[PDB]
Amino acid sequence: PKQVQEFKQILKLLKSGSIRAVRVKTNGENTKFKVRCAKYLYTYICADKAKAEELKKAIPKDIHVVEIAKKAP
Amino acid sequence: VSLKLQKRLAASVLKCGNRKVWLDPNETPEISLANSRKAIRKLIKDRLIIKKPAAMHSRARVVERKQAKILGRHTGHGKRKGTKNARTPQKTLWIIRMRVLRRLLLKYRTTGKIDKHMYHDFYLKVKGNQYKNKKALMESIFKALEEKKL
Amino acid sequence: FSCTIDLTNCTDFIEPKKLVTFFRQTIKVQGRAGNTKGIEVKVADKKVTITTSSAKLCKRYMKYLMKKYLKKNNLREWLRVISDKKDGFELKF
Amino acid sequence: TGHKGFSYKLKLGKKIHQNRGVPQWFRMKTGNTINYNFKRRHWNRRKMGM
Amino acid sequence: GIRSVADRIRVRMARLPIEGEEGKFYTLVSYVPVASFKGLVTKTVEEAEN
RNA sequence: AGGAUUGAAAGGGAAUAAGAUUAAUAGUUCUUAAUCAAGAGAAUGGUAACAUAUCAUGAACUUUAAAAUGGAGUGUGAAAAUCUACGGAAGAGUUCUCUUUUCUUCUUAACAAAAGUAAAUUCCACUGAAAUGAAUCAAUCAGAGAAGUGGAAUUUAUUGGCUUUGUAAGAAAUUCAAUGAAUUGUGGUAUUUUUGCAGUCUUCAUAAAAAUUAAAGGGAACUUUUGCUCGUACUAAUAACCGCAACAGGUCUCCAAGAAGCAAAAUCUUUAGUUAAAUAGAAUAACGCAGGUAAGGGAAGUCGGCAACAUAGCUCUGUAAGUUAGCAAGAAAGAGUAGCUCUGGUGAUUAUCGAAUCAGAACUUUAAAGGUUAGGGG
RNA sequence: CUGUUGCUUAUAGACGAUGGCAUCAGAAAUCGGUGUUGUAAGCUUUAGAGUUUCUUAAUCAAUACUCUCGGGUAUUGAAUG
C-alpha cells in the first residue's frame, strides 16, 4: 500500500483509466480516499471537508464507490 | 453425557484454556446439542458458556517490601547471602566513576576553565585513581588553578 | 470535573437524600473524613451529582464509594453499578 | 513420518486398506470357512516393519 | 485443607421423605455456624410453621 | 569450452503476511493486502569522500567481490519481557474493621513512505601538533599526518535504525444494550533475554565447496499471461518411538511470568496441563523398607568412624611449617549478623529527578545466616 | 441353653479368642473437677527511640503495661453429674 501526499496526483490519478474501485472512510477528524488501482492501493488523508467534496465529485460513474462509516460494510 | 467435545471447542472459541471455560450446570441438555462451533458461538452470547477470570495475584506484599528496602529496613548483614563484589561489582563501580569524572574534565576544558596542558595532567591523574569522587576533583582543580596565577 | 449518579429506577430501594449525607462524610480529598468543604453534592432530585472542580477527584472513586455503600446495607446483591459512558453512573438490577 | 516419499505413502495406504475384516455377506456363503482375517494387525500390537 | 478439620462442628440433620416415594426417607446434614460452643447442647429443632 | 553419477527435509537457497473459518487441515482455505521468476505489449552534479521514483547503450576475453566460515572476555545501540512514574477510560474482588484500595484490558503484520531524530565505524576538504596531544572500562592513534570545523558512506531483525505514516481500525481486545454503541496519552540515568556494532585476547588449531549473483578493464555491434510433480492428519512420550507391555530405562531441538538470592540453586504461586496414571475398605500385632529423636559416657562397637551426627551464607581481624617462589589458604583461630525509627556517602540538567549499594546512631525483643540452599578441621 | 449381630465395645486383641453391657442398655453434647501452654481478639497507658507535618497537630512507629492466673486445649486409651 502506498500513500499520495497532496491534491496534484490524486486528482490526476482518478482521471486515469487504470482505477478499479474507490473506497472512502470517514473518520472522526479526517477522511481517506483509498482508491484501488491495478497494483497498489493509494489513499489521500484529507482533513478539510470542503476539499473532500470536490474529491467526491471527481470519481467517474463507471466504477464502484463505497462510503464507509463507523460500521464496516 | 460427556461434554468433552463441547468444552474443547469453547476453549478455542474463547481463546482460553480448558480450565477457564465455564459451562452452565443447569443447562446440560441445551449445551449438549451444540456439536459445532457455530452452535457454541451462540451459547457464549446466551451466557451459557462464560470465561472464568484469572486468579488474583496481588503485588501489594512485594511493593511494601521494596518500599521498606529503600529506607534500608532489611539491608542488614544477616540478610545478605552473596559476596560484596557480587552485590556491588567492583568493575561497574569504577566504569561509572570515570565516566562521572572524565565528563567533568571535558566539560571544564570545553567551557574554558582549564587548558589542554592542565587537562592532560588531570586526565592521567584521574586514570591513576587519585580522586575518589567528583567532589574531590573539583576541589583539586580549584586548588591547582590558584597555584597557576603565582 | 463532574460525576452524576442515576437513581431513576432504584429510588425505592435508596432514598436519594441518604446518599447525599454519606458522600460528604466519607469522601476524602487530602486525607481526612468529612472534609468535603470544596465538594458539593446538592440534591438534583432523581439524580445525584458532585460537579466539583476544586478537588483532585476521579470517576472511579465514585464507583468505589458507591460499591462501598451498597455493602453498608447489604444491598449489593440486588443492585449493580454500571457507567452510562457519558460522565456518570447508573444503577441496574 | 511427516515427510514420506511418494512410493512410500502409497504402500502405507495399501496396508490400511488390507487391515479390514471379512465383509458380512461373504461369511454367509455355502461352505464358507473364512470367518475371520488372520493376516490382520494393529499399530500397537505388531509393527509391520516397513 | 485436607490436613486439618475443624475441632468442633455444629451440624443440623433433617429426616425428609425422598422425592419419588414418600415411604423412603433421607437425611440432609446442613451446617450451622456458631460463634462459640459454650452452652450449646444437642437441641431438637422443631419449626412447626405454615 | 575443460571434465562423468550419486551425496545434506540441521550446510548454500529468487519470492507472504494479518484477521477469520472446520467435529480435525491450514505461512496450504476465505477476506484484505503484497512479493519473486520467465515472458508479451550513446547523461549530469560535488574540490573530495560520493549522489541521481529501471533509466542515462556495452559483445568476445580477463579479473575482483559476495555466497563464505573458530573461540574467549569487556563496553554499548536497539526491540521484547518484567518492574515502575504522571494522567486516565471499562469491568471484577474485600468492606462492619479499615483501604482515593487489589486485579484484568488499553494491541498491530508482510510490504512501502520520509514530519522529526540517534549510537558506532571508515573516509574527504581547510590548517599543520612539542610546553606533545587525542581519547577507552581496557586499549589504541598522529608530520606516509593527530586535535578542531564542515561534509560523505555503511551497519543497527523490511524499505532507512527509533518515534511517526499507508496497510489500519473497517481488524482485534475490554465493556454496555437487545444486531447497535464507547475508549485505546506520555515517560524511566531499572533487571533479564534476543540481535547487531566496536576494538582487546588465544592457537606448533588460522577455523569448507559449488550452484548462483554484481561490478570493473575492453571496445564488438504502465498493463497483462503462466508458475507443473511430491510431503502436509496425529504422538514427539511417567500411554502413539526403541526396550516381548499403558516397562521408574533410553531418545536431538525452539519459546520461557512473579517472590528470593550472587545464582536458570532449594521452597511457594500466575498463563497452561492434570487429579488418573500395575485396585480399595477396616484393625493400628510381630519382623520389615523409607524418614526421625534421646538421659549419662562419647569409637569402649567393628577388619575399618561403615552408617549416622556435627562445620556450612556473608563482613572484619588474622593466617604456620614447606615450596618449583607460582602456591599451601576458604589454612588454623576469633568477633559481628534481628526488628523499628533515623542520618550520611556514591549522580544528570539548571531547586527538580533517578539507582540499588556501603557506612554509622538510638530504642525494643524470645540476642537474630540456618524454613530451604549451605566446607568438618589438623 | 449356646452362637451370630449391636455398643464403629473394654481391663483383650494380627484374624479367631477373651472380658463387660445389651432398654435400669448405650451414645452424644454441655457444666464442673484435673491437666498443657503462657496473658487471646477490640480500644486505651502524650509509655515508646525518632521522622513527618499542620506550621507551634495529628499521622507512622519494634516493643509495651490496664481489662488478663487471660484466650486456646483437655481422652483421643482421664475421672463426676
The DSSP code sequence of chain D is --S--HHHHHHHHHHHHSS----TTGGGSTT----S-TT---TTT-----
Beta strands in chain E (DSSP E): 11-12, 15-17, 25-27, 30-31
Measuring CA to CA, how many Å separate D39 from each of B32, B42, D10, D44? 41, 49, 19, 15
C-alpha cell of B114?
Answer: 582549564
Cα(C81)–Cα(C59) distance, integer angstroms: 13
- The one-character DSSP state at C66 is H
DSSP collapsed to 3 states, chain B: CCCHHHHHHHHHHHCCCCCCEEECCCCHHHHCCCCCHHHHHHHHHCCCEEECCCCCCCCHHHHHHHHHHHCCCCCCCCCCCCCHHHHCCCCHHHHHHHHHHHHHHHHHHHHCCCCHHHHHHHHHHHHCCCCCCCHHHHHHHHHHHHHHHC
Instruction: Give chain D's largest Cα–Cα span.
Output: 47
Cα(B25)–Cα(B9) distance, integer angstroms: 17
Count of other CB atoms within 10 angstroms of residue C28: 14
Burial class (CB in 10 A: 0-12, 13-18, 19+), D23: exposed
Through-space separation of residue B142 CA and nucleotide F305 C1' in angstroms: 72
Through-space separation of residue A5 CA and nucleotide F156 C1' in angstroms: 29
C-alpha cell of E11?
Answer: 451440624
Asked if A37 CB < 7 A from strand F, the reply is yes
Which chains border C (3 or more CB–CB pairs < 8 Å)?
none
Query: Among B122, B118, B128, which residue's Cα sits nearest to residue B103?
Result: B122
Helix axes B116-127, B135-146, angle to 10 degrees: 140
Amino acid at B49: I
Q: How many CA atoms lie within 13 A of B82 on its CB side?
A: 6
Please, which residues bridge with residue A34 across strands? Answer: A23
Count of other CB atoms within 10 angstroms of residue B55: 5
Q: Smallest Cα–C1' distance to nucleotide F135: which residue has it?
A: B123
**Cβ atoms of C89 and C63 closer than 8 Å:** yes
**The nucleotide closest to C31 (CA, C1' atoms):** F100
Asked if E39 CB < 7 A from strand G, the reply is yes
Through-space separation of residue A41 CA and nucleotide F166 C1' in angstroms: 9
**Cβ atoms of A33 and A47 closer than 8 Å:** no
**Cβ atoms of A24 and A67 closer than 8 Å:** yes
Cα(C50)–Cα(C66) distance, integer angstroms: 13
C-alpha cell of B78?
Answer: 544477616
Q: How many CA atoms lie within 13 A of B73 on its CB side?
A: 8
**Cβ atoms of C23 and C41 closer than 8 Å:** yes
**Cβ atoms of A2 and A42 closer than 8 Å:** yes
Cα(A44)–Cα(A40) distance, integer angstroms: 13
Task: Give resolution in angstroms.
Answer: 3.1
Instruction: Give chain E's largest Cα–Cα span.
Output: 44
Cα(B108)–Cα(E39) distance, integer angstroms: 87
Q: Which nucleotides of G are covered by protein (CB under 7 A)?
A: 28-31, 72-74
Query: Among A48, A19, A1, which residue's Cα sits nearest to residue A10?
Result: A19
Q: Which residues of B58-75 are buried (b: 16+ CB within 10 A; e: fewer)?
A: eeeeeeeeeeeeeeeeee
Through-space separation of residue B82 CA and nucleotide F330 C1' in angstroms: 15
Asked if E36 CB < 7 A from strand G, the reply is yes
Express the helix, strand and coil content of chain C in percent, nearest 5 each.
Answer: 25, 15, 60
Cα(C80)–Cα(C76) distance, integer angstroms: 7
Residues 6+ apart with CB under 8 A from B40: B6, B9, B10, B13, B34, B49
Instruction: Please tell me whether residue C63 adopts helix, strand or coil conformation.
Output: helix
Cα(D42)–Cα(E14) distance, integer angstroms: 57
Q: Where are the alpha helices (DSSP H) in chain E?
A: none
Count of other CB atoms within 10 angstroms of residue B47: 10
- The one-character DSSP state at C68 is H
**Is the dihedral angle over the CA atoms B38, B42, B48, B53 positive or is it negative?**
positive
C-alpha cell of E49?
Answer: 410453621
Which residues 16-55 in chain C have a CB closer than 7 A to strand F?
Answer: 28-31, 33
Question: What phi and psi values does residue C19 have, to the nearest 5 degrees?
Answer: -60, -30
- The one-character DSSP state at C88 is S
C61 membership: H or E segment, kind and range: helix C59-70
Cα(A2)–Cα(A4) distance, integer angstroms: 7
C-alpha cell of D10?
Answer: 502409497
Amino acid at A5: Q
Amino acid at C31: G
Instruction: Please tell me whether residue C20 adopts helix, strand or coil conformation.
Output: helix
Q: Smallest Cα–C1' distance to nucleotide F171: which residue has it?
A: A72
Through-space separation of residue B31 CA and nucleotide F25 C1' in angstroms: 26
**DSSP string spanning chain A?**
-EE--SHHHHHHHHHSTT--EEEEEE-SS-EEEEEE-SS-EEE-EE--HHHHHHHHTSS-TTS-EEEE-SS--
Experimentally determined by: cryo-EM
The residue whose grid cell reads 574531590 is B136
